[PDB]
């Protein structure tokens, strides 16, 4: 006959979400070429047009320098594979500097200020092959079986 | 100036289409199992339920015995990869006796009344591996880019 | 001259992302028969559809306070010229898209 | 003199779907049958038939 009150907390992050409102820069004059990319994964630049002024990007592969991370957008993205993706032949929202949430494949929390190493598919890994100049921003969390890590980005 | 009038002819048939109103038979108490079936290709039976009465069918593979050919239906099909198919876990119209138009991979017209040889993927092809008890009904046409052939089906 | 040689329609909404249209077809045949016949041929019909997309365009310009004051005093402002240049750039981009296309954007 | 003929098929589900959506399927098949008859007549007049003399 006694009443019961309960309490629940929200999750703090989603893949490809901008971590906070610090100094950031979005490179939005790019176009997806040769396939599709995942929100929360790194991309590489294929070529930059001399006159038209659009860069050509795709998912990261072996032996390629990353350029940025795709970020969430409720308008520019299409829903496929139960998640947000960017389809081929369309404008993309690439983040080049700032704090972002990234998909992870590691199993242990990282160290603040250490260098970020990626996997061959553009996802963070504690023992990846591709080396970057980015550093960890401190965040490390999970959303319903999806691991997320907070990454600091600076311009190339 | 002098007026002009023109003339055009329709196509003859479609993949998985009933050829004529001869004595046919349709089995509609079947369900697609583990995959999808192209309209106009042969199917095989993997299991007949002892008491429930339904039959489990799937696309033809190597070293099996064909049972029938899927036919066109505007209501009980799904439009996928620009063709019309039967999807997994759904009722399927399977024709077990009569004349039907089906896909072909051959290059020359066949002989009337001779035995039909099917390919491993379930489409008719000369000098094929799988042997049936079906005979050619004398039909050799073509849609815009699809080869078709008329086959006479006898019940197993 | 691309909006003056090709028709312009105003059906799409300002908040749409894709449009689509349909097409239909049919087949069939006939034959010469006898009085006792059981194999009359049949007919059918078809359908198909297509797709199209929409794109956004943009640019910008800068100006300082000293230039604003100099334009106000000398009688020749510098901001209106830049606004005209921006409008001309947009129109020329539309014309170039119509008459030359864009390979990366399909 | 000669005779011509064909036929078409339909099911109850297709009839109901055509009534509900607004695009019936039987009218298109009837039109196809009539067009096939007319085109066969035209072919006989202008192209002829060898087995039928």
């Amino acid at each position: 006959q006694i009443n019961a009150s309960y309490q629940r907390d929200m999750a703090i992050a989603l893949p490809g979400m901008v971590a906070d409102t610090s100094k950031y820069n979005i490179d939005g004059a790019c176009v997806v070429n040769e396939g599709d990319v995942l929100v929360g994964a790194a991309v590489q630049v294929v070529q930059a047009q001399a006159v038209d002024g659009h860069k050509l990007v795709k998912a990261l592969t072996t032996g390629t320098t990353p350029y940025g991370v795709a970020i969430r957008s409720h308008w520019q993205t299409v829903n496929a594979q139960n998640q947000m993706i960017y389809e081929d032949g369309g404008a993309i929202n690439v983040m080049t500097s700032g704090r972002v949430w990234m998909l992870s494949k590691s199993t242990e929390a990282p160290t603040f200020g250490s260098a970020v190493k990626l996997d061959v598919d553009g996802q963070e890994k504690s023992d990846g092959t591709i080396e970057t100049t980015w550093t960890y921003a401190g965040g490390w969390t999970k959303y319903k079986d999806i691991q997320l890590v907070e990454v600091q980005l600076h311009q190339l | 100036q002098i007026n002009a009038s023109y003339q055009r002819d329709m196509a003859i048939a479609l993949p998985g289409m009933v050829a004529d109103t001869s004595k046919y038979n349709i089995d509609g108490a079947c369900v697609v199992n583990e995959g999808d079936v192209l309209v106009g290709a042969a199917v095989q039976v993997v299991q007949a339920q002892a008491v429930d009465g339904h039959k489990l069918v799937k696309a033809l593979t190597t070293g099996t015995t064909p049972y029938g050919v899927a036919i066109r239906s505007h209501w009980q099909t799904v439009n996928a990869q620009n063709q019309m198919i039967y999807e997994d876990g759904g009722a399927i119209n399977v024709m077990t006796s009569g004349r039907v138009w089906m896909l072909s991979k051959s290059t020359e017209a066949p002989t009337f009344g001779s035995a039909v040889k099917l390919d491993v993927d379930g489409q008719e092809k000369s000098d094929g591996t799988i042997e049936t008890t079906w005979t050619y009904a004398g039909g050799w046409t073509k849609y815009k880019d699809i080869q078709l052939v008329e086959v006479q089906l006898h019940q197993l | 001259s691309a909006l003056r040689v090709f028709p312009v329609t105003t059906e799409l909404s300002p908040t749409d992302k894709t449009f689509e249209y349909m097409t239909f077809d049919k087949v069939g045949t006939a034959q010469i028969i006898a009085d006792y016949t059981d194999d009359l041929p049949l007919v059918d019909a078809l359908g198909t559809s297509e797709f199209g997309k929409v794109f956004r365009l943009g640019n910008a310009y800068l100006i300082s306070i000293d230039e604003i004051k100099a334009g106000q005093a000398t009688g020749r402002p510098l901001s209106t010229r830049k606004a005209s240049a921006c409008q001309l750039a947009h129109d020329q981009l539309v014309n170039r898209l119509v008459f030359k296309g864009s390979a990366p954007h399909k | 003199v000669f005779r011509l003929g064909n036929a078409y098929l339909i099911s109850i589900d297709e009839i109901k779907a055509g009534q509900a959506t607004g695009r019936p399927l039987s009218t298109r098949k009837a039109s196809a049958c009539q067009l096939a008859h007319d085109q066969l007549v035209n072919r006989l007049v202008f192209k002829g038939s060898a087995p039928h003399k």
Binding site: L14 | - | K17, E20, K26 | -
Partner: peptide, 26 residues
């Protein structure tokens, strides 16, 4: 499942005009 709040059908336009093939009789 981390989709968005709007589906495709809500931001899609269906043109109200169909095209038919032409088969003249003769």
């Amino acid at each position: 499942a981390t989709m968005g709040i709007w589906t495709a059908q809500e931001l899609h336009r269906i043109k109200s005009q169909s095209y038919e093939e032409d088969y003249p009789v003769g």
